[PDB]
Design an enzyme around this catalytic site. Structure first.
Site, PDB file in Angstrom:
ATOM      1  N   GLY A  29       0.747  -1.256   0.000  1.00 48.98           N
ATOM      2  CA  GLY A  29       0.000   0.000   0.000  1.00 48.98           C
ATOM      3  C   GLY A  29       0.779   1.310   0.000  1.00 48.98           C
ATOM      4  N   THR A  30       0.097   2.393  -0.366  1.00 51.34           N
ATOM      5  CA  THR A  30       0.721   3.704  -0.441  1.00 51.34           C
ATOM      6  C   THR A  30       0.787   4.341   0.942  1.00 51.34           C
ATOM      7  OG1 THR A  30      -1.442   4.627  -0.938  1.00 51.34           O
ATOM      8  CG2 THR A  30       0.080   4.239  -2.784  1.00 51.34           C
TER       9      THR A  30
END
Lengths: 243, 240, 212, 233, 66, 244, 54, 242
Positions: A29-30
């Site tokens: 994920g970011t």
């Protein structure tokens, strides 16, 4: 070999392996950060512009629960949204029986108890999301970050995503620079700075920045999206700092 | 709770458990059926031969379903009890709601129905049973003989055989039962059914049971003496 | 509300009225009180209108689904014992049923069956249900013979509905006849009950009593 | 192709991966190409319809969900039948109860939330089909991308299917052009032909194998086919 | 001997099995006591080798994927 | 996932046999031996315990002989725990028939229903088959004395004699010689001890490794009596056939 | 443009595959019509089976 | 064991590939739909001279304008015929009107989809299968004679003509030449037998063949075994003129 296969079986030495594996999903994920302030709390996430075809400010990943608790997550992105449902169902259930919005420490406990079930049984999968959610009520501001294991802690600040390291070191240095708690009005600006630095990691595809805040002083405890002019001042401030 | 799939399709276009079903039938006993033009005859060999083993109270392998339907079964004998049970149930719930006894056609579908429907649910193995169903249509004279599979398929036959060593007696029947000319009488048919069994029974009259169903709920069994008589007759003629 | 049916030589005559009242108010005079269950069964409408119409269409469905299922057409006796055992389920829920199911098959001959709400199911040669149940018996039973010309049997049905229609309040409207043969029911059509009265008053010379 | 992990969606891999999802993603690329592009007054779908052999007829690829909304399938045809029902059902549920047009935004998020349940529970396969949902409401025109994974995102333009990239590339060179197209119904359809011809590589363009759907501010959901797409082409 | 006629009757057959109809008509000419293999010994021979070598799928399983 | 852990009791082998069921037929032949003998004049039901220790209270125990109702007694071979379930389920079914017909259950019926229960465990539901076999000994008006046995498959057959448990083949050949069809009750008793005194694995046959029970029509006024003998009357007829 | 997810070894396997098509006709120059047609002859693709349900 | 659940990393549910084999094993079933009468003819494949030919049923009546022929295991089909019969009659109670032919296919295709794991209380009453095809043929006002092809996939197409079963490949190649748009009823009936003769194991007779049509006035009607014996006899005259 056979402890690797299985779900919810203790290893010889005593650890569950699929809790450990579930951490991997958080690092794919970011970036996302929260910053606890003196007034309330600021949320922010890096939204990657993965193509010229996406539309701007329409594929928002920041999602409220009730009208005083900001939520944004990292992990598997469908699997996030379904915990933002679960939250809503419990939130609403509390308002029927006790006629008041739910207290933020309580919102934490029950949300955690759901995650915990999916490591009790072998039949459903351990949830693959690390979440940030928090907001203000009568006790005050609270920040929480929930790990796939089923654990949360309170925090002066917290962050998640592939660029957690680069944010964690600036976040100490925003406990030193301002040891009494900066205002939430200052912290819109300080939030942007920490995304623009943790974007070198995900410098592959250019980004678009999203902040939001919930505080007793500004918005009357009502979580909102920073937008328009106040969003322009924070963008140009962190952009010219990191260049 | 248990519903784990047992009809795992074979990639060769089959189903492993439905082959095995057909195999378990082959293990068990033999039974032969032949239809004259005014009778049906169900003979089956009985391994209930064993000094000090009753036959009065031991159940024969030919069962009565209704007044004018009779069943014979090869394959697992624990299992046979079920299909009897269900068919009996049926036979009454037909009288109750539509009147009139079961058409032999109908009861055939219905037994066949039950065996198919055990391959659908996961919690249950197929019945490894094939059956002969025989009877005469209400207020008629039409012999009928039907046989079903543990697949669930069904067909009428002029005569058929299921159980062990069915190939010997089918090969015997091709030559010796004409398809255009059934055995004329009840005695001529019965002589023909004995002669078919006495190929795989290796003589003896004590072994084999012969029941005949005729039209108008005539379910009768031949007793030891009669069997012996017929056998002896076939002995003199054959010898000569 | 007069529905009658009698067995005779050539088969069955059904005969019905068509005035269906709701209260004192006369709702409609066009209500066809036959229900074609398929081309070899005819089922009447007497009793409560909803319970009757709907449920014999549903009977129509088990007929096109027994018929495919064995490939043998439903017996008349068996059809009835469906319908009966369905409404027995709901006994004591105010559903209101008075039908005759009429058919002629080649295994049973012309046979009327009379299905009723209690669960009573009777075979018989004459039934007549509804308001005109006693007037209709009377005219019919004098003039009724097991031997009769088909033509005469049509004229015996007219006169039976006629009689109940004159004296009864809720019977009136129009008359209807059907003639069941083996091959199916054929419709012998609709005669107005106000033209029909005056032919038979003059022609026969009855109803002296009536003025005019 | 086994070993490691390829069993239920329950078993979760030391790599960080969930294989079954990825497998499901391969499934869409098997089916026939579909493009979807919009402007502010019209949203079009073009999909390629296909036939088993040449006696066989084509297959219905575009599905009208309602008179203001619709999807087009790519990949599995049994799966698309389950999910098209459920969006009939739900857009009916919002006209009955609330009397509101089911907003495109909402309708995406609900589908996402139903997909999630199939990958958490033991048994149940992941749904393995991809839907491009176009539609028009009071918020203008939308296009949505349903991945099997569960993700929904709004785009101006996309494609997914067999040799899609040939269509995706064309749509980016012209991004600047087709949003500025407004009011010409004809001009929008005809841009979308020239976006799907790139995908046809080793495939001839038939006119009766193409399915075309416009929805706009004054026209309901309408599928063109047969004679009507022989005007444009 | 129309080579189309024996190729039709046969189902979908390799060329290593289409070589074995000649060899099974050659072994049936010897049984029948013929100096010539004819169009009669090839029609019988098809029936025997297509049944025979078709039945039983070696292991009739394989797979080992999932 | 969980399919791996599944034993599949239910499935057929490539023999078409239920391998599970064959195993169960084993677990009977481990357990102590029980012998059935039909006479015209009564039924002698006789079984030698498997247990043997010198601290067993023989007087207090039944473990191989249970009454079902007043006309019908069973002898048990296998696991006693398993058995005890079936044996209560029998007892309730006997009574259910008595409330509904005021006419004691015919012996054919009662056996048939036990047999149906057993079968069901090996049709469906991935249960383990019971490890049990019964000798049924029972009397009615219809057929007279009747003997049956049912095995863990759920298939029963009648008999004029039979043996279950260990040394089944050994027992069966001793009976084939000796039984004549005419025996009284007292001669039948003597053939039962004779057949049990050879097969016994322990060296001596003792009055406290035996259980004996009778079902006799020599009770007057046309009535049947059961009686399970005490361990102190089996001692008196152990000296009668000279075993001591 | 007309290639995508071709690694450099397939693409050497396209330019040679085009100039065969030129030797089959007999041409001494490989035109732009043969480099397009060699792209379909070496893709690490021949499709496993025409679709039956996708 | 493969799941029903699991995917093959190609993208495929192993089980569907295995189902579509079972069609091909079962007996030949031809259908030719023309604008003047759909003809369905199947090969019975009587397996012994003892077995009675006409008890076997593989042409089956769904209602009185939708006839249907089945290929594959006839058992699997027993459940799916009954489901189809009910639904078509349900519609005729509910709208007093012929069920569309296309619509009926869809409801069969829906049950075909079912074979699922049977999670929670949800009713999937099968766990497996439905390895059979249908040639669902019919006539309605909306579209003329139609013909539809069901799979165990849950996937169906309309077809001007389609063969299925053992000789499907051979029959397919003769159909792409012979099929036309000008066929009469009488020419199509003779043409079906000619394509069915090539891939019949045994000699073309009516003791291993059954013919049927659906024609506008008649509805469904299976032919008499006497009529069929006569159409066999007339094929060999035309062929022996050539």
């Amino acid at each position: 070999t056979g402890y690797d296969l299985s779900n919810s079986v203790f290893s010889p030495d005593g650890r569950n392996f699929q809790v450990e594996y579930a951490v991997k999903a958080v690092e794919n994920g970011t970036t996302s950060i929260g910053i606890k302030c003196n007034d309330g709390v600021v949320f922010a996430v890096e939204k990657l512009i993965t193509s010229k075809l996406l539309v701007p400010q329409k594929n928002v990943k920041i999602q409220v629960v009730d009208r005083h608790i900001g939520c944004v997550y990292s992990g598997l992105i469908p699997d996030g949204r379904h915990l933002v449902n679960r939250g809503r169902e419990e939130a609403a259930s509390f308002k029927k029986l006790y006629k008041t919005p739910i207290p933020i420490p309580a919102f934490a406990d029950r949300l955690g108890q759901y995650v915990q079930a999916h490591t009790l049984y072998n039949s459903v999968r351990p949830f693959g999301v690390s979440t940030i959610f928090g907001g203000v009520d009568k006790n005050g501001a609270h920040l929480y970050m929930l790990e796939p294991s089923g654990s949360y802690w309170g925090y002066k600040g917290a962050a998640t995503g592939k660029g957690r390291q680069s944010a964690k070191a600036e976040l100490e240095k925003l406990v030193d620079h301002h040891p009494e708690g900066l205002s939430a009005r200052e912290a819109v600006k300080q939030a942007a700075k920490i995304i623009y630095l943790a974007h070198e990691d995900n410098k592959e595809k250019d980004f678009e920045l999203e902040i939001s805040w919930c505080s007793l002083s500004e918005t009357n405890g009502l979580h909102k999206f920073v937008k328009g002019d106040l969003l322009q001042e924070a963008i140009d401030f962190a952009q010219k700092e990191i260049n | 709770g248990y519903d784990r799939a047992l009809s795992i399709f074979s990639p060769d276009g089959h189903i492993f458990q439905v082959e095995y079903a057909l195999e378990a039938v082959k293990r068990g006993t033999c039974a032969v059926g032949v239809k004259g033009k005014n009778c049906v005859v169900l003979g089956c060999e009985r391994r209930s031969t064993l000094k000090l083993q009753d036959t009065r109270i031991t159940p024969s392998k030919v069962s009565k379903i209704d007044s004018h339907v009779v069943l014979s079964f090869s394959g697992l004998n624990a299992d046979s009890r079920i299909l009897i049970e269900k068919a009996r149930v049926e036979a009454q719930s037909h009288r109750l709601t539509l009147e009139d006894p079961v058409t032999v056609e109908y009861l055939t579908r219905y037994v066949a129905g039950v065996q198919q429907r055990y391959t659908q649910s996961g919690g249950v193995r197929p019945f490894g049973v094939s059956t002969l169903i025989a009877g005469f249509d209400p207020r008629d004279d039409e012999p009928k003989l039907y046989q079903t599979e543990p697949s669930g398929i069904y067909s009428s036959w002029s005569a058929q055989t299921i159980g062990r060593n069915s190939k010997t007696v089918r090969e015997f029947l091709e030559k010796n039962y004409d398809r255009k000319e059934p055995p004329a009488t009840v005695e001529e048919c019965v002589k023909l059914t004995v002669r078919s069994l006495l190929e795989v029974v290796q003589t003896g009259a004590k072994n084999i049971e012969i029941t005949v169903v005729k039209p108008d709920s005539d379910i009768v069994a031949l007793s030891s003496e009669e069997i012996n008589q017929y056998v002896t007759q076939i002995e003199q003629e054959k010898q000569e | 509300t007069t529905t009658l049916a009698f067995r005779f030589q050539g088969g069955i005559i059904v005969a019905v009225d068509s005035r269906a009242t709701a209260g004192n108010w006369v709702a409609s005079q066009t209500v066809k009180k036959v229900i074609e269950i398929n081309p070899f069964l005819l089922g009447t409408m007497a009793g409560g209108a909803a319970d009757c119409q709907f449920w014999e269409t549903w009977l129509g469905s088990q007929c096109r689904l027994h018929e495919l299922r064995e490939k043998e057409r439903i017996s008349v006796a068996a059809a009835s014992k469906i319908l009966s055992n369905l409404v027995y389920q709901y006994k004591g829920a105010g559903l209101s049923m008075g039908t005759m199911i009429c058919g002629y098959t080649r295994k049973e001959g012309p046979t009327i069956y009379y299905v009723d709400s209690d669960g009573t199911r009777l075979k018989g040669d004459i039934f007549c249900v509804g308001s005109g149940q006693t007037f209709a018996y009377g005219v019919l039973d004098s003039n009724y013979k097991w031997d009769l010309s088909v033509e005469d049997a049509l004229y015996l049905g007219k006169r039976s509905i006629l009689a109940a229609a004159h004296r009864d309040a809720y019977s009136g409207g129009s008359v209807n006849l059907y003639h069941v043969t083996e091959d199916g029911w054929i419709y012998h059509g609709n005669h107005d009950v106000g033209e029909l009265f005056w032919k038979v008053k003059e022609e026969e010379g009855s109803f002296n009593n009536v003025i005019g | 192709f086994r070993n490691n992990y390829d069993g239920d969606t329950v078993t979760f891999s030391p790599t960080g991966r969930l294989f079954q999802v990825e497998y499901a993603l391969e499934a869409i690329k098997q089916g026939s190409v579909t493009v979807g592009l919009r402007s502010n007054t019209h949203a079009v779908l073009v999909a390629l319809k296909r036939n088993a052999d040449e006696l066989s007829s084509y297959q219905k690829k575009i599905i009208k969900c309602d008179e203001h909304m619709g999807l087009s399938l790519a990949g599995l045809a049994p799966d698309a039948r389950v999910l098209s029902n459920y969006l009939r059902q739900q857009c009916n549920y919002s006209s009955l109860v609330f009397n509101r047009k089911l907003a495109v935004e909402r309708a995406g998020h609900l589908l996402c939330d139903k997909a999630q349940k199939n990958t958490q529970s033991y048994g149940g396969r992941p749904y393995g089909v991809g839907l491009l949902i176009i539609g028009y409401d009071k918020s203008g025109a939308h296009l949505l991308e349903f991945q099997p994974s569960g993700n929904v995102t709004e785009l101006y333009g996309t494609a997914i299917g067999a040799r899609s990239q040939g269509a995706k590339t064309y749509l980016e060179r012209t991004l600047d052009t087709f949003i500025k197209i407004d009011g010409n119904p004809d001009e929008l359809i005809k841009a979308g032909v020239e976006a799907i011809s790139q995908s046809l590589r080793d495939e001839s363009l038939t006119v009766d194998n193409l399915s075309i759907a416009i929805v706009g501010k004054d026209t309901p959901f309408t599928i063109y086919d047969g004679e009507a797409v022989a005007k444009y082409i | 001997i129309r080579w189309e006629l024996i190729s039709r009757l046969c189902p979908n057959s390799t060329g290593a099995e289409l070589r074995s109809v000649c060899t099974e008509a050659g072994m049936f000419a010897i049984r029948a006591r013929r100096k010539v293999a004819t169009e009669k010994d090839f029609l019988k021979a098809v029936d025997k080798v297509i049944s025979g070598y078709k039945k039983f799928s070696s292991t009739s399983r394989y797979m080992q994927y999932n | 996932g969980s399919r791996r852990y599944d034993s599949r009791t239910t499935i057929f082998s490539p023999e078409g046999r239920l391998y599970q069921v064959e195993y169960a037929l084993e677990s009977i032949s481990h357990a102590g031996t029980a012998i059935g003998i039909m006479a015209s004049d009564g039924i002698v039901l006789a079984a030698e315990r498997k247990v043997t220790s010198t601290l067993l209270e023989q007087d207090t125990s039944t473990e191989k002989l249970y009454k079902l109702n007043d006309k019908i007694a069973v002898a048990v071979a296998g696991l006693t725990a398993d058995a005890e379930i079936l044996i209560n389920t029998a007892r309730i079914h006997a009574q259910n028939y008595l409330k509904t017909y005021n006419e004691d259950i015919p012996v054919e019926i009662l056996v048939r229903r036990l047999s149906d229960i057993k079968q069901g465990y090996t049709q469906h539901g991935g249960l383990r088959p019971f490890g049990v076999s019964f000798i049924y000994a029972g009397y009615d008006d219809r057929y007279g004395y009747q003997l049956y046995t049912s095995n863990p498959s759920g298939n029963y057959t009648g008999w004029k004699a039979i043996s279950v448990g260990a040394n089944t083949s050994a027992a069966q050949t001793l009976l084939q010689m000796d039984y004549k069809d005419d025996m009284k009750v007292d001669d039948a008793i003597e053939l039962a001890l004779k057949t049990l005194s050879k097969t016994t694995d322990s060296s001596a046959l003792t009055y406290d490794r035996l259980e004996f029970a009778t079902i006799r029509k020599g009770a007057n006024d046309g009535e049947v009596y059961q009686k399970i003998f005490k361990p102190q009357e089996i001692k008196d007829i152990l000296v009668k056939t000279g075993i001591t | 443009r007309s290639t995508d997810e071709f690694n450099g070894a397939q693409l050497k396997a396209v330019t040679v595959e085009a100039g065969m098509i030129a030797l089959r006709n007999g041409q001494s120059s490989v035109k732009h019509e043969d480099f397009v047609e060699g792209i379909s002859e070496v893709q690490a693709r021949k499709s496993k089976s025409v679709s039956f349900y996708a | 064991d493969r799941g029903v659940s699991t995917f093959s990393p190609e993208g495929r549910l192993f089980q569907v590939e295995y189902s579509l084999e079972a069609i091909k094993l079962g007996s030949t079933a031809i259908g030719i739909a023309t604008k003047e009468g759909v003809v369905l003819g199947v090969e019975k494949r009587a397996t012994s001279p003892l077995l009675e030919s006409d008890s076997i049923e593989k042409i089956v009546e769904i209602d009185r304008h939708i006839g249907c022929a089945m290929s594959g295991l006839t058992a699997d089909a027993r459940s799916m015929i009954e489901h189809a019969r009910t639904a078509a009659v349900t519609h005729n109670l509910y709208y007093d009107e012929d069920i569309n032919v296309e619509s009926l296919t869809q409801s069969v295709c829906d049950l075909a989809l079912r074979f699922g794991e049977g999670a929670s209380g949800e009713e999937r009453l099968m766990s497996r299968p439905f390895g059979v095809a249908l040639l669902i043929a019919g006539h309605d006002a909306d579209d003329g004679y139609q013909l539809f092809h069901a799979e165990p996939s849950g996937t169906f197409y309309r077809y001007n003509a389609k063969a299925i079963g053992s000789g499907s490949e051979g029959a397919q190649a003769e159909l792409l030449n012979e099929w036309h748009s000008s066929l009469t009823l009488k020419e199509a009936e003779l043409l079906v037998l000619k394509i069915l003769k090539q891939v019949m194991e045994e000699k073309l007779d009516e003791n291993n063949a059954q013919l049927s049509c659906i024609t506008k006035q008649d509805g469904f009607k299976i032919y008499d075994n006497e009529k069929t014996a006569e159409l066999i006899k007339e094929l060999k005259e035309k062929e022996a003129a050539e």
